[PDB]
Design a protein around this ligand. Structure first.
Ligand SMILES: NC(=O)c1ccc[n+]([C@@H]2O[C@H](COP(=O)([O-])OP(=O)(O)OC[C@H]3O[C@@H](n4cnc5c(N)ncnc54)[C@H](OP(=O)(O)O)[C@@H]3O)[C@@H](O)[C@H]2O)c1
Ligand code: NA
Length: 311
């Protein structure tokens, strides 16, 4: 129903929405913005609390579309989480965490979202030169001014996280985590759990690989970055496909699909309070929410844990 996100006062439905496909034209071709707006709208309608966006998502367009749909509802009923770090250069970006850039980022985010505040603001990526506790202190200024209500870091190393949380101002960590890449459990979970930092994973389905989207006979076109991901190369691809299918029975048992079981597993981790599955259309959102109805047995959780053991 409602999960508290770590040290913050954020109460959210365990299934949030990823908005990279809402006006994220730089990421996807032929996006229909009205479809994106309708998806966001549907999400809020269906009880989703958290909308996860970022500056890179359409260079601000994602925040803009979300901002338009927001006028339709009550601001206090939605948790807006956005990020910044990408600094435009030469048709490419460089990460910037300097105080001046982060504060500017917040003010520009607020204008694009057309709102008085942002619930959760992230440092999307770490830059290589700014002391991370100073970057966070900069965001902390906007927090004190009431412009953001919580701060988070993303894609930080344990060391950079420690530095950023030097004064305990980091409430959320968003990192890459899935059944094929469980490193966070050893490298981050201990610390986050300790310091009551909520952990939000991304890339939980590994491009559909862990969602039953393919078969062992699936093939991709030359140049497709997928048949170059690694978990897709050589015997790794077939191996993971054949390994994911071993979850079919559990899915059947709970009357859902493999992706629902996979995600429910992540949610079952004491260290994770919410997921941010993506979507292009409203209907897809309604299918993501079903994950929240799943309750795996300790027996199911253990099997999956062993089945997807690192080594
Ligand atoms: N740095 C950050 O903080 C951050 C945060 C979020 C995302 N990202 C990046 O954005 C990208 C997307 O992240 P993501 O978390 O959305 O990754 P993701 O786990 O790869 O997206 C889910 C993938 O699974 C498929 N899928 C979803 N639901 C499915 C279902 N019910 N049945 C079958 N297939 C299903 C989707 O296919 P279709 O699209 O074909 O439906 C999609 O390819 C990643 O490359 C990631 O690195 C970064
Ligand atoms: Na949990």
């Amino acid at each position: 129903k409602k999960a508290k996100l770590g040290k913050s006062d954020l109460q959210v439905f365990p299934i949030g929405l990823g908005t990279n496909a809402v006006g994220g034209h730089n990421l996807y071709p032929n996006l229909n913005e009205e479809t994106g707006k309708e998806l966001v709208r549907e999400a809020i309608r269906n009880g989703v609390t958290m909308l996860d966006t970022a500056y890179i998502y359409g260079i601000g367009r994602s925040e803009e579309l979300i901002g338009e749909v927001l006028r339709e509802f009550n601001r206090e009923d939605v948790v807006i989480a956005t990020k910044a770090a990408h600094r435009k250069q030469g048709n490419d970006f460089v990460f910037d965490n300097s105080p001046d850039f982060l504060k500017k980022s917040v003010d520009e985010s607020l204008k694009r979202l057309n709102t008085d505040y942002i619930d959760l603001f992230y440092i999307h990526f770490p830059d290589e030169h700014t002391p991370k506790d100073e970057a966070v202190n900069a965001l902390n200024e906007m927090k004190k001014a009431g412009k953001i209500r919580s701060i988070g870091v993303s894609n930080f190393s344990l060391e950079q996280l420690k530095e950023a949380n030097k004064d305990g101002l980091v409430d959320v960590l968003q990192g890459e985590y899935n059944l094929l890449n469980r490193e966070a459990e050893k490298t981050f979970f201990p610390y986050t759990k300790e310091h009551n930092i909520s952990f939000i994973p991304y890339f939980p389905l590994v491009s559909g690989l862990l969602a039953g989207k393919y078969t062992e006979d699936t093939t991709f076109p030359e140049g497709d970055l997928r048949n170059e991901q690694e978990h897709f190369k050589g015997e790794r691809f077939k191996e993971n496909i054949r390994k994911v299918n071993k979850l079919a029975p559990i899915a059947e048992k709970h009357n859902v699909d493999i992706p629902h079981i996979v995600l429910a597993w992540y949610l079952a981790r004491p260290e994770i309070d919410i997921l941010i599955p993506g979507a292009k259309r409203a209907d897809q959102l309604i299918d993501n929410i079903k994950t929240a109805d799943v309750t795996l047995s300790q027996e199911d959780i253990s099997f999956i844990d062993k089945l997807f053991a690192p080594g």
